[PDB]
Design a protein around this ligand. Structure first.
Ligand SMILES: [Cl-]
Lengths: 226, 221
């Protein structure tokens, strides 16, 4: 499932080059979303919301430098970035209208908005605390070696550690918590397919975990993953 | 009945809000007073209504309460957040934004998810509670009336507490279940089903209470 993910994010490469040039967070997420959706239904909105701020700081240095500069750029965003991000979300998928109007009115930038998200929201928490999960994921990969194997090991690691907010919202808190327990016991390749197939038959896709795996890859790449 | 008994403990908080008219401290005092010896959802719905108890009819009460909500300040938000925490870093972070952006109770509810029934109600003039009250008034004053409103609402609105615990799917199923359940025992069936499943539609209950109040004030016989 790495393939699908790699192609679809790669449809957004022109948007990413634009972000590296203009450093425009909101617009960036929105362009990325519109772009990699030109011709497809997986999207991965969260991957873009995670990656665009890191890409906007592509030249800050290594992986700790990027994350810090991305947090700093996030704090200097304005309410229009929030509005773009919100529009990107709706396209990914008068309540939106009322939210948009309060974002506007109170001038709630993307950082401040993210500080008001619930604790289960992993991407929000990355946007606010300097990308701590992505960095930990990057360090995991780096201790491994440049391989697809490492990326898989990363994925199951994140799967056993963080209940997926998308799963929480679809299947409920207890089913999300249960994934972490099944993940930590899915060690062989066979055990892992079982799980994948259970998640599928159930309609439970841990999108955020894959999102975080991607942002971790990005940091590990910038750090030097040899 | 258990719910009546459950609310009654907050009665002095209700009397206090009727005179003092401060929504947030009202919710917070109701929550603390109910704990002695969505409890929370019910109070968040009732307090604004109760602070407008003397506005007149049910339409006047809802509209007066919407207005009081609009004239709220960030402190009302802070009090409701404390009331919620008392009732269920990140909360310190949300409080931080509320204080700093001076987000009042109405503005805060305006940023809530689509599915948040109580937020909707605080923002749009208690539309659901109004409809509920009209349901009661054309039905007549009894327990069958209240029981009927409950399942009616249960069939109509997925309950956000159920969503958050069991997820969007199970909650959507409740409505459809409730839609079927007509008989004294079919409803007994659904309730037992929910109990063992650990799902409680507390928001449906809250909304039934807010409807009742508005129907009482309109004149319900
Ligand atoms: Cl810049």
């Amino acid at each position: 499932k790495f393939e699908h993910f790699l192609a679809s994010a790669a449809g957004a490469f022109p948007a990413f080059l634009e972000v590296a040039e203009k450093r425009i967070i909101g617009e960036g997420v929105l362009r990325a979303v519109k772009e990699s959706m030109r011709w497809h239904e997986n999207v991965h909105f969260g991957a873009f919301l995670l990656l665009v701020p890191l890409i906007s700081s592509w030249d800050a240095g290594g992986m700790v430098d990027i994350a810090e500069a991305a947090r700093n750029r996030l704090r200097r965003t304005d309410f229009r970035d929030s509005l773009s991000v919100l529009e990107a979300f709706r396209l990914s998928n008068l309540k939106d209208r009322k939210t948009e109007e309060e974002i506007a009115q109170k001038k709630i930038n993307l950082y401040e908005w993210m500080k008001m998200a619930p604790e289960e929201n992993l991407i929000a928490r990355e946007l606010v605390d300097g990308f701590k999960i992505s960095i930990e994921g990057a360090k995991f990969l780096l201790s491994f070696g440049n391989s697809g194997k490492a990326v898989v090991e990363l994925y199951y690691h994140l799967l056993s550690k963080f209940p997926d907010p998308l799963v929480i919202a679809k299947m409920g808190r207890e089913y999300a918590e249960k994934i972490t327990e099944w993940a930590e016991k899915a060690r062989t390749e066979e055990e892992r397919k079982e799980l994948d197939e259970k998640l599928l038959k159930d309609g439970a896709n841990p999108g955020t975990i894959a999102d975080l795996t991607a942002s971790s890859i990005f940091l590990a790449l910038a750090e030097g993953w040899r």
